[PDB]
């Protein structure tokens, strides 16, 4: 009787926000991003893309509890560069990277069939 519904892992209720931004007070140019209803599939690729940025001093992700469905991403950037634009640049580069991969994959699959 206490089992949560299966769709609880990816569906947002009314009033919940997908992503919330909180400034970090301990150190300058730091920020914390809370993503609701996500798991490692999205946090890991975002963190790895961020670590490629030369202007990102820190990037990490965690899931506070496996039974809960939330991710926390901490981004620290050098002072000339907002963490918010670092995050959006990582996303917009990963999207482009995936689109290129899909196009090459479909071309290769076409060439595999009598090519």
């Amino acid at each position: 009787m206490n089992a949560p519904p299966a769709f609880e892992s990816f569906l947002l209720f009314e009033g919940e926000k997908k992503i919330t931004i909180n400034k970090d007070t301990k150190v300058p140019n730091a920020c914390l991003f809370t993503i609701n209803k996500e798991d490692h599939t999205l946090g890991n690729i975002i963190k790895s893309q961020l670590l490629k940025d030369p202007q990102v001093l820190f990037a990490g992700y965690k899931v506070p509890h496996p039974l809960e469905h939330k991710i926390i991403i901490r981004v620290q950037t050098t002072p000339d560069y907002s963490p918010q634009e670092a995050f959006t640049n990582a996303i917009t580069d990963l999207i482009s990277e995936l689109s290129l991969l899909e196009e090459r994959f479909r071309v290769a699959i076409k060439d595999k069939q009598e090519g």
């Binding site: 030369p54 202007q55 001093l57 050098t78």
Partner: protein, 148 residues
């Protein structure tokens, strides 16, 4: 500037009594000029070293010729002339012990400075006149450089 110690050493021996760790090994080396002893723990995976090899140590309080007492914080981005740019193997630790040959009346002749880099230990044992700037609880860089 700031150079706590500077000399050229020769590996007299590798870890005796076997190796206790597969990535790090203990090496014993001697000096030509100052004729003093070093025991150093180094990781072989990234910086392999062989018996009979010859290298140069520069223990310094900072990595800048300006001698500006740096943060102990890791900052990858710094467009400053680093002392490590001319060196191959660079560590960073704090000196935690200084032993001496002193007695109740006379001063120290031979000194032994023990410094640990993240758990990798070094004992530098010579004469008191050379290990002068070593003070307990001080941050030091070992900059090593292998030479033919």
């Amino acid at each position: 500037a700031g150079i706590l110690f500077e000399d050229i050493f020769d590996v007299k021996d590798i870890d005796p009594e076997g190796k206790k760790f597969d990535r790090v090994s203990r090496l014993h080396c001697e000096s030509e000029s100052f004729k003093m002893d070093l025991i150093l723990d180094v990781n072989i995976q990234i910086y392999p070293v062989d018996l009979g090899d010859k290298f140069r140590l520069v223990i310094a309080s900072t990595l800048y010729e300006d001698g500006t007492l740096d943060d102990g914080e890791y900052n990858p981005t710094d467009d400053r002339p680093s002392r490590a740019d001319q060196f191959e193997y660079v560590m960073y630790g704090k000196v935690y012990r200084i032993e001496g040959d002193e007695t109740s009346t006379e001063a120290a002749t031979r000194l032994s400075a023990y410094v640990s880099y993240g758990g990798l230990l070094m004992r530098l044992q010579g004469d008191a006149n050379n290990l002068h700037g070593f003070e307990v609880d001080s941050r030091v860089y070992l900059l090593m450089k292998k030479l033919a």
